[PDB]
Design an enzyme around this catalytic site. Structure first.
Site, short mmCIF file in Angstrom:
data_model
loop_
_atom_site.label_atom_id
_atom_site.label_comp_id
_atom_site.label_asym_id
_atom_site.label_seq_id
_atom_site.Cartn_x
_atom_site.Cartn_y
_atom_site.Cartn_z
N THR A 168 0.86 -1.19 0.00
CA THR A 168 0.00 0.00 0.00
C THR A 168 0.89 1.23 0.00
O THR A 168 2.04 1.08 0.35
CB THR A 168 -0.86 0.00 1.26
OG1 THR A 168 -0.92 1.34 1.75
CG2 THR A 168 -0.32 -0.91 2.34
N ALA A 189 -5.32 -4.28 7.04
CA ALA A 189 -6.55 -3.50 6.86
C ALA A 189 -7.44 -3.66 8.07
O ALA A 189 -7.98 -2.66 8.54
CB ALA A 189 -7.27 -4.03 5.66
#
Lengths: 200, 229, 249, 235, 241, 240, 197, 239, 213
Positions: free
Chosen positions: A1, A49
């Site tokens: 990410t 996440a």
């Protein structure tokens, strides 16, 4: 990410990619990595996440209760410290989170970085994630406190794009938000492919 | 009125009545006398038994907490055993921690603290027994009394129990600081004799002596000899 | 009717009677007096116990050394006092372990006073029935005398007496004490004079009083209980001084 | 009948023991607070020296933290517990949110502690009412008052303690925007008001001012003497 | 002929001959000690109004807070002991938030009342937890909000019972205000009529003459979030009366 | 006199009245009888039908406390159902730890001790139920045990509890139960239950009969309706 | 990986720290301040495992501040050190050991300037000069060679500048700017950041 | 006097009666009446709700514990809400653990045990809600009533609440007809029985009647204000 | 030694639509190389408008379904309404995170109709991250199935091809085909496919037969 956030005269610009990978399988190319904690303060998620979403969500509940109880919006600094304190309690149990709480408060534009390790640092420019290293370079060369809002938007987009090209675990679309004094506004969500055409 | 029933309530006049009532229990108890001679301390008490049927060897009013400390009580008998057991235990705890026999003063402070604890809570009743604790530590004789209140005083000589006031007066008249224990044990039997209200016999009285050797209970034969005087 | 039981019920008129009743108990207790002098602070107490067959085995019946730099005298239920003195000694030692410095005097008093307030607020326990005078030297405020009440309210007094005939003593002290001029020698004399008036016995026995003085010598505080010979001299000096004033009269 | 237990409610729904604790506050020494535009002034009467008693130990006005100061009227010991607990919270908030406590947060915390004591039998309501003065981040002066019940209200000016009724009447008439215009004028108003209830003169008033960023300052007895003199002269 | 012995009133956990549990009943009486609050639910929205009862001019009016926001959708007007209300408003605020966290949705006014009610019911020593007030709570709350079913006003009482009410008045003059409300309320009334009607009723019940300072008024129309009329807005409506 | 208010208290004359007051509760309830014969133990309860609305075969006062033991209760029913639960739990525990069906004498003792505890403390009232337990095991034999609210437990060759206990005992006494067999006793129990019932005071009764014995193979079971019906007929005819 | 240096003197204590906070290899911040002011005249400088450093420092700072509000007199520098050590030591045995290395610098009117050093294991040592960090190995010797117990303040900043320039010349990690502050009877005084551009 | 012996649940009276439990039983009478009846295939609960004021809505007297079980409360609402939660959780527990609808009878035993503990121990007041529990389980339709005293009874039909004797009277006379009744007939019989409880001036309206029906094919359903209209329309006029 | 988890296999697919939501799954439970059962549908109907599909350790799936079913009932009793698909998703997210430290090895997909009446698919990672996604494949064959759906349903990497909203018929055809492909190349998936179509009328269950290994 890759998540990028920088503070400029007109506000804080927060940007992020949208790819989540389990192993090397790209589970989703549409994950929304900028979490809108409140109408006035927003956070970003790097690392696991689940850890980021549950913990950011909890912060949002805490912020609303404070706004109702104290009749005023929580300051970004206070918000960061609450998140930092909560994550520290779980230190060494494996939570992985890197987040950049961003908001405008009485103090001014505020950007903070909190990590599962425990660090909380407030700074003009921060980038978190696997592709942070690639992003820091583009942002660093073009950053200035005095950037026109349009130029600021461009730097963030180019920066996530260059990161998506180099980092395998980052890609998808760049979602970009500007935290203006009134509140967060969602400026754009360009797919990297379209960006490749414009930039090249 | 209301002040009398509660133990956590100070009466107008600041008197905790239940404790005062508790002391009254000790007064009703069998006479006990303690004399601290230079060479030793003699603890003696009346063990008058309702019937010849009772076996005297079974229970002893004078008990040894440790080799050098012994106690006698006036008051409620069941309570004495609880305190004696806690005392024997508190001493062993001192030995384990400091590997030295507990100084007598220290045990009396510790036993008294236990007594004070019972006083504080409403649920429990103050202990109704007063203890005379005698010990030889550091080459010095010591005698102490702990009342149900939780207060310890150090007495060269004292009497607790029925006719305590008269007993103390007899003792003040007959007490000499330089007295040796052999003379002192005689003084004590005389003090008990004042309030015995029966022919004293070896069984009727129980006596204990503390010296360099340590606490011991004179056996019935020895007392018979002392009584013969 | 009765708003004076349980220690947790404010009376109409807002008075907590059980604490007030406790304060009454201190009045029955033997008089204890503390005087603050520029050189040192002294605590003198009347040993109410006078039964002929009692032994002075302890360092003092009513003066207790809480820590190297402070001491206390207790008036009130003795058993309650023993509990508080044990606690004070622990509270002080805990400060030394944590900050490795002697407990400041006010703090030791403030902490005990807090234990005393709690006993008043919670329902089951009786308010502690003891009033105690604390004397100590702290680097911050030098020599200090503090008096405590069953209420948990504490105060700093240049001189004060707790216990029987306390009022008479304070009145005598109010005229006699000279602020900024007291020396331990003069104070010990003031103590004998006030104690003589308060105590019923015509002659202080010198075995009926215990006087302890705290002075800093060579950078270390010394709390010394004056021995009987020393007190006997003080009584004689007072007897002569008063007699001389009577002889002049 | 219905006055012996905090939990019991009277026919007519009055909880009597809480009201009685409020009576206790009245027996306590008077305290007055005036919210000036740039200064908040808290003033408390001192009962007496007693001659042989050091005055440093007796302090009605205390600083909960750098930006918050509290004055109390009521059982003195209870105040020391509440003041201490408030101080721990002020520091704890700074630990938890990294930010200095707002005056109201401290007022709400102190109030909750008191309510907690009123809620259950087995604890007696703290018999203290307090005036908490503070300056907020915006710098607006704030004055709040709390009562043994746990109700907190903000007052532009208020008096708690004995004679509070008289001073509050005086304050209602005397208080005006004009009076708060000058920082000295604000100090004068509280002194004048306390004078109304204090049997003696300036010798018996302890007064303190907190400025916009300055720490609480207890005015020296001489500074008080100067102010009483200006007021007496103007009289 | 007077038999006034009572003797079962004192102490909750005691059932009177006739099974009346009087302590709870006495708590319901306490709300009468409080300032009157009136809520009207209309299709356009639910309006809540309360009398401040300001003791002294020096006290700042804003601090008295008899109408508060549980969440944007739901607001509460409370009459009774202010302190116990603060606890009940807090349970409500946390429960609305807990629902957002767990289910990402907004609690209906009814569920929020059930939630605060559950806390109120605990006064009976129902649970073994130490931190539960033994006394029944002394507050009555009127909770009004726009939910899936549209504008709704629920009234909660110290017993913990809650019911939807088209219009209810809680407080000192509730009897009589309710009577007037019964005559004025018609289901079709628009919020504008209700605000005027509620303020007319309050003017009659309140001892002092109505002024913007003495009253607090709020509305939760379906599009808007809880709104508290500001002094300027209040002045306009009071002038119309 | 405050002596009777609590069970902690003892009256000046030595009597703990609250326990005695609890014993009076059982007398309020309808009579229940248990007779032990050589083969096994038969229990019977006269269950008053308070209302036609209540379903028949419900509001049972006879409970099975374990496969081999049955309990008949008189007194406040709520307490009894709760005591039955305590008994069932105890029986399960004995099987779980000691691995066999609980000996009844032990069961009675364990339940009695639980009942006695309530007698000592002031927080809890004495239980208001008096119950009878019976079991037949080939090794143990047939055993009937009755527990009073006090916690006294004793073994009875024949026993009665309830309002008509005294009257029933007289009838049970003339039975020579030891020689009698289980099937015959069921008729006899019914006769006694019918004799004791007072038609004027109590409008109507349904006899509930249960039995444990060699015939039931040591399982306490409700008497089959055919057997019950035959007995109810025998009883009415005998009542004449 | 973080450098703390303190030089005590006749009347002052000079303390300096690197201003870099870093992740794996990216130096996220160039202006981190590792000095926390416990009191007007006490500064605690803390370097250590991330999170533990800020958390321990804040706890100590607030507790020291509570003493000021509660008693009215600030804690002595020595007392504070003993307090921090007690807390760290108590935690070392616990499942949550703060891995922090600290240097505490304070001026007490009665006892003069003081610098205390505590390692992660919680040993406390008063020292004339001390340093924590990998950098300390390179610079402790320079101080040892040029330090006099009578060093002047001007001389001390100079000695510190010499110590820091060695870190620029030889230490592998890049610590570009340092923050310098002096505690004296007047109190903590900030001095210009010594920055090697 | 006898004021003594009535203060606590822990004091037995001189004649064997615990007065507080009896006082608690009186609470059910204070509540509005509810009638429950059963047919071989269905079980029905009907209730007469009461309203604080015209503006206020009528209270909920019928609550759904589970698909197979539902209860009607007569007495203090608070005790009912608490007991209902316990019952709901006990039912949910059975489905998670054994994946079977809890037998209705077993639930009533559990409600009895929980209810009894307050009666013997100093502290919590006896629950003062009287509950009618209706459910269809494999054994069949079941109607059970629970007293504030923990005692529970299985009934062909029962009415608990104010003026409930009148309803019990009607139910007893028309009881035989109920077993073979169709659902419409059974609810109709019940609505008539609760009508008896109502004061003569008052009449059953859509607003004050709530009907709850559970059956082999019907999950417990509480027909409410507008859905009672089918059952009510067929009814006649007051006798 | 004891390993608390085993991979029981299976694949789940969910396709949203303008008005319909389709959730489909294999029916084979396989431990190791053996086939435990060839009839264990992995799709469960939470409510009329929602179906949950779970693949992973079966033991966790059974417990999770039981927990979600219980909680749905509790929401109904307390709030007097059915949980929406959005709510079930959020609740599941919290439930899954509860065990972040000893996790549930279940890949879960919730597909259903939203309040607007449109079809919504929510896909969750084993630790509870949830994303609303138009089509999602979970399980052993997520890797094989997801790319095809992305080309066909998402029209990705296709140039000069018009975008047509999916129809229930085209989707049923697509779901059947993708599963047929996985049966051939994923050892775990096979035996049968249960397709559950949620539409305003309600869940309809259709079973087709994929190749037995």
């Amino acid at each position: 990410t890759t998540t990028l956030a920088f503070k400029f005269r007109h506000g804080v610009i927060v940007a992020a990619d949208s790819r989540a990978t389990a192993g090397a399988y790209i589970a989703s190319q549409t994950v929304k990595k900028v979490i809108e904690i409140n109408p006035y303060l927003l956070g970003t998620m790097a690392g696991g996440a689940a850890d980021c979403s549950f913990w950011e969500r909890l912060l949002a509940r805490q912020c609303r209760i404070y706004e109702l109880r104290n009749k005023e919006r929580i300051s970004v600094a206070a918000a960061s410290k609450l998140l930092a304190n909560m994550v520290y309690q779980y230190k060494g149990m494996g939570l992985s989170m890197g987040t950049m709480i961003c908001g405008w408060d009485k103090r001014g534009p505020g950007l903070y970085y909190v990590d599962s390790e425990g660090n909380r640092i407030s700074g003009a420019t921060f980038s978190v994630g696997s592709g942070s290293v690639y992003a820091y370079g583009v942002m660093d060369r073009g950053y200035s406190y005095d950037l026109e809002v349009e130029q600021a938007y461009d730097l963030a987009r180019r920066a996530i794009y260059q990161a998506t090209y180099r980092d395998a675990y980052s890609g998808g679309a760049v979602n970009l938000y500007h935290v203006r004094e009134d509140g967060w506004i969602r400026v754009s969500s360009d797919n990297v492919a379209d960006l490749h055409e414009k930039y090249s | 009125r209301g002040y009398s029933f509660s133990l956590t309530t100070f009466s107008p006049s600041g008197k905790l009545v239940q404790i005062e009532y508790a002391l009254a229990a000790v007064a009703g108890g069998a006479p006990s006398v303690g004399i601290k001679a230079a060479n030793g301390v003699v603890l003696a008490t009346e063990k008058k038994q309702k019937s010849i049927l009772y076996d005297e060897r079974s229970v002893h009013k004078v008990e040894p907490i440790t080799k050098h400390i012994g106690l006698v009580y006036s008051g409620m008998g069941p309570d004495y055993r609880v305190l004696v057991h806690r005392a024997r235990k508190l001493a062993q705890q001192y030995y384990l921690v400091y590997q030295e026999p507990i100084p007598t003063a220290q045990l009396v402070q510790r036993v008294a603290s236990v007594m004070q604890e019972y006083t504080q809570s409403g649920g429990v009743r103050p202990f109704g027994v007063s203890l005379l604790i005698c010990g030889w530590n550091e080459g010095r004789p010591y005698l102490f009394q702990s009342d149900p209140s939780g207060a310890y005083f150090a007495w060269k000589a004292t009497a607790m129990g029925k006719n305590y006031v008269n007993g103390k007066t007899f003792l003040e008249k007959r007490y000499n600081e330089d007295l040796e224990l052999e003379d002192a044990i005689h003084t004590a039997i005389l003090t008990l004799k004042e309030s015995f209200e029966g022919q004293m016999t070896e069984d009727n009285i129980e006596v204990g002596i503390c010296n360099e050797a340590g606490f011991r209970r004179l056996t019935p034969t020895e007392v018979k000899d002392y009584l013969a005087a | 009717r009765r708003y004076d039981s349980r220690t947790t019920i404010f009376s109409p008129e807002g008075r907590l009677y059980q604490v007030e009743y406790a304060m009454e108990a201190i009045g029955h207790a033997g008089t204890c007096l503390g005087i603050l002098a520029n050189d040192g602070v002294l605590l003198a107490a009347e040993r109410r116990n006078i039964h002929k067959l009692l032994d002075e085995v302890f360092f003092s019946e009513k003066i207790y050394k809480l820590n190297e730099d402070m001491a206390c005298s207790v008036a009130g239920i003795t058993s309650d006092a023993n509990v508080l003195t044990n606690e004070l000694r622990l509270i002080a030692q805990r400060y030394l372990l944590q900050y490795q410095e002697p407990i400041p005097c006010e703090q030791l008093v403030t902490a005990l006073c807090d234990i005393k307030q709690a006993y008043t607020q919670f329902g089951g326990k009786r308010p502690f029935g003891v009033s105690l005078l604390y004397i100590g030297w702290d680097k911050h405020y030098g020599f200090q005398l503090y008096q405590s009440d069953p209420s948990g309210n504490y105060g700093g007094w240049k001189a004060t007496c707790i216990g029987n005939n306390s009022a008479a003593a304070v009145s005598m002290l109010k005229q006699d004490y000279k602020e900024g001029e007291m020396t331990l020698k003069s104070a010990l004399a003031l103590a004998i004079k006030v104690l003589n008036k308060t105590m019923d016995v015509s002659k202080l026995s010198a075995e009926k009083v215990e006087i302890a003085t705290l002075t800093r010598e060579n950078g270390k505080t010394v709390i010394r209980v004056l021995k009987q010979k020393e007190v006997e001299q003080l009584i004689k000096k007072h007897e002569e001084e008063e007699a001389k004033a009577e002889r002049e009269k | 009948s219905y006055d012996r237990a905090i939990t019991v409610f009277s026919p007519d729904g009055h909880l009597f023991q809480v009201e009685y604790a409020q009576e206790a506050v009245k027996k306590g020494s008077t305290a007055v607070g005036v919210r000036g535009r740039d200064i908040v002034v808290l003033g408390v009467e001192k009962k007496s020296v007693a001659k042989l008693q050091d005055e440093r130990t007796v302090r009605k006005i205390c600083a909960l933290d750098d930006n918050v100061c509290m004055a109390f009227a009521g059982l003195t010991a209870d105040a020391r517990i509440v003041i201490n607990r408030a101080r721990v919270e002020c520091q704890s908030h700074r630990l938890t949110v990294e930010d200095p406590v707002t005056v109201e947060y401290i007022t709400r915390y102190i109030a909750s502690l008191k309510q907690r004591y009123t809620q259950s039998n087995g604890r007696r309501p703290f018999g203290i009412s307090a005036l908490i003065v503070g300056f907020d981040f915006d710098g607006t002066p704030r004055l709040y008052q709390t009562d043994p019940s746990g109700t907190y209200h903000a007052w532009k000016a208020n008096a708690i303690g004995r004679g509070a009724k008289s001073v509050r009447e005086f304050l209602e008439k005397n208080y005006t925007d004009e009076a708060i215009e000058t920082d000295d004028l604000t100090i004068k108003l509280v002194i004048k008001a306390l004078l109304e209830v204090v049997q003696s003169g300036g010798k018996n008033i302890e007064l303190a001012v907190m400025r916009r960023d300055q720490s609480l300052k207890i005015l020296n007895p001489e500074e008080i003497e100067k102010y009483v003199a200006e007021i007496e002269k103007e009289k | 002929m007077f038999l006034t012995r009572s003797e079962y009133d004192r102490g909750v956990n005691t059932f009177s001959p006739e099974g009346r549990l009087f302590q709870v009943e006495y708590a319901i009486e306490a709300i009468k000690l409080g300032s009157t609050a009136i809520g009207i639910q209309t299709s356009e929205g639910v309006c809540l109004a309360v009398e401040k009862r300001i003791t002294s001019p020096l006290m700042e009016p804003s601090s008295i807070e008899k109408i508060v926001e549980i969440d944007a959708h739901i607001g509460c007007a409370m009459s009774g002991l202010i302190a116990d209300a603060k606890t009940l408003i807090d349970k409500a605020r946390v429960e609305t938030q807990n629902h957002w966290f767990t289910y990402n949705e907004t609690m209906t006014v009814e569920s929020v009342t059930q939630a605060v009610s559950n806390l109120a019911l605990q006064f009976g020593e129902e649970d073994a937890d130490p931190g539960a007030m033994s006394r029944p709570f002394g507050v009555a709350l009127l909770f009004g909000g726009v939910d899936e079913k549209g504008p709704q006003l629920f009234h909660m009482d110290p017993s913990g019972t809650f019911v939807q009410c088209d219009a209810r008045a809680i407080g000192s003059a509730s009897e009589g205000a309710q009577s007037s409300l019964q005559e004025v309320y018609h289901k079709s009334m628009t919020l504008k009529e209700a605000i005027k009607s509620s303020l007319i009723i309050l003017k009659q019940v309140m001892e002092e003459k109505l002024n913007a300072t003495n009253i607090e008024l709020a509305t939760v129309q379906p599009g808007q979030n809880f709104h508290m009329f500001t002094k300027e807005e209040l002045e306009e409506v009071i002038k119309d009366i | 006199t405050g002596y009777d208010l609590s069970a902690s208290t003892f009256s000046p004359d030595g009597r703990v009245f609250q326990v005695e007051y609890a014993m009076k509760a059982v007398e309020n309830s309808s009579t229940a009888i248990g007779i032990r014969c050589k083969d096994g133990v038969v229990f019977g309860v006269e269950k008053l039908v308070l209302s036609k609305l209540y379903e028949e075969g419900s509001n049972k006062r006879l409970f099975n406390v374990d496969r081999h033991v049955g309990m008949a209760v008189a007194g406040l029913l709520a307490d009894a159902r709760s005591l039955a639960d305590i008994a069932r739990e105890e029986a399960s525990n004995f099987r779980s730890n000691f691995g066999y069906n609980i000996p009844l004498k032990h069961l009675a003792d364990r339940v009695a001790m639980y009942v006695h505890a309530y007698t000592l403390y002031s927080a809890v009232r004495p239980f208001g139920c008096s119950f009878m337990l019976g079991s037949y095991s080939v090794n143990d034999g047939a055993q009937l045990y009755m527990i009073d609210p006090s916690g006294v437990s004793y073994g009875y060759w024949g026993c009665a509890i309830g309002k008509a206990r005294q009257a029933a005992k007289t009838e049970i006494e003339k039975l020579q139960m030891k020689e009698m067999t289980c099937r015959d006793i069921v008729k006899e129990v019914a006769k006694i239950i019918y004799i004791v019932h007072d038609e004027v005071k109590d409008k109507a009764f349904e006899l509930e009969l249960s039995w444990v014995g060699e015939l039931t193979n040591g399982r306490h079971e409700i008497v089959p309706k055919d057997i019950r019906e035959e007995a109810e007929k025998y009883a009415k005819e005998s009542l004449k | 990986m973080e450098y703390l240096i303190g030089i005590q003197g006749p009347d002052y204590v000079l303390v300096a720290s690197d201003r870099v906070a870093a992740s794996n290899i990216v130096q996220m911040k160039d202006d981190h301040d590792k000095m926390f002011k416990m009191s007007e005249k006490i500064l605690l400088l803390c370097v250590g495992e991330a999170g533990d450093t800020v958390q321990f420092a804040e706890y100590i700072q607030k507790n020291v501040q509570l003493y000021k509000m509660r008693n009215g007199y600030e804690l002595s520098p020595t007392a504070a050190a003993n307090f921090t050590r007690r807390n760290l030591a108590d935690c070392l045995r616990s499942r949550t050991p703060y891995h922090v290395n600290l240097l505490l610098a304070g001026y007490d009117e009665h006892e003069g300037p003081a610098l205390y050093y505590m390692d992660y294991l919680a040993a406390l040592a008063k020292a004339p000069f001390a340093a924590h960090g990998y950098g300390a190995f390179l610079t402790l010797s320079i101080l040892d060679r040029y330090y006099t117990p009578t060093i002047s303040r001007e001389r001390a900043v100079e000695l510190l500048r010499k110590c820091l320039e060695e870190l620029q010349k030889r230490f592998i990690l890049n610590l570009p700017t340092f923050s310098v502050r002096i505690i004296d009877k007047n109190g903590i005084h900030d001095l210009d950041n010594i920055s090697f551009p | 006097f006898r004021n003594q012996y009535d203060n606590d649940v822990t004091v037995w009276s001189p004649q064997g009666r615990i007065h507080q439990i009896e006082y608690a039983m009186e609470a059910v009478k204070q509540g509005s009446a509810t009638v429950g009846l059963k047919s071989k295939t269905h079980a029905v609960l009907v209730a007469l709700k009461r309203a604080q004021s015209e503006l206020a809505a009528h209270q909920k007297k019928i609550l759904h514990v589970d698909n197979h079980i539902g209860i009607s409360i007569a007495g203090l609402t608070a005790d009912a809400r608490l007991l209902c939660n316990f019952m709901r959780q006990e039912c949910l527990d059975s489905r998670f653990v054994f994946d079977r609808p809890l037998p209705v009878s077993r639930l009533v035993s559990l409600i009895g045990s929980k209810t009894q503990i307050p009666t013997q121990r100093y502290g919590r007041r006896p629950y003062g809600v009287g509950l009618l529990i209706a459910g269809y389980d494999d054994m069949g339709p079941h109607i059970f009533q629970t007293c504030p005293s923990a005692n529970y009874f299985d009934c062909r039909a029962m009415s608990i609440g104010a003026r409930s004797q009148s309803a019990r009277t009607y139910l007893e006379r028309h009881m035989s007809e109920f077993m073979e009744c169709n659902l419409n007939e059974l609810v109709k019989h019940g609505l008539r029985a609760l009508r008896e409880t109502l004061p003569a001036e008052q009449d059953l309206t859509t607003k004050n009647v709530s009907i709850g029906i559970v059956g082999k094919d019907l999950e417990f359903t509480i027909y409410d204000d507008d859905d009672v209209s089918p059952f009510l329309e067929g009814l006649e006029e007051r006798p | 030694r004891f390993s608390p988890y085993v991979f029981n296999g299976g694949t789940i697919l969910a396709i949203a639509g303008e008005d319909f939501a389709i959730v489909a799954s294999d029916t084979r439970l396989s431990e190791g190389f053996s086939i435990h059962t060839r009839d264990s549908p992995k799709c469960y109907k939470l409510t009329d408008k929602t179906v949950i599909g779970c693949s992973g350790f079966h033991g966790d799936c059974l417990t999770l379904t039981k927990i979600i079913e219980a909680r749905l009932k509790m929401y109904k009793h307390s709030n007097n309404k059915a949980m929406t698909t959005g709510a079930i998703a959020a609740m599941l997210s919290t439930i899954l995170y509860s065990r972040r430290f000893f996790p549930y090895y279940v890949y879960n997909i919730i597909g259903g109709l939203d309040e607007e009446g449109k079809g919504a698919v929510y896909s969750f990672d084993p630790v509870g991250s949830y994303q609303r996604d138009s089509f999602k494949a979970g399980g052993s064959a997520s890797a094989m199935l997801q790319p095809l759906l992305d080309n066909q349903v998402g029209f990705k990497n296709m140039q000069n091809v018009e975008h047509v909203p999916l129809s229930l018929d085209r989707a049923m055809r697509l779901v059947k085909d993708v599963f047929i492909s996985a049966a051939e190349r994923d050892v775990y998936t096979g035996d049968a496919l249960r397709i559950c179509i949620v539409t305003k009328e309600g869940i309809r269950e259709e079973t087709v037969s994929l190749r037995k290994d």
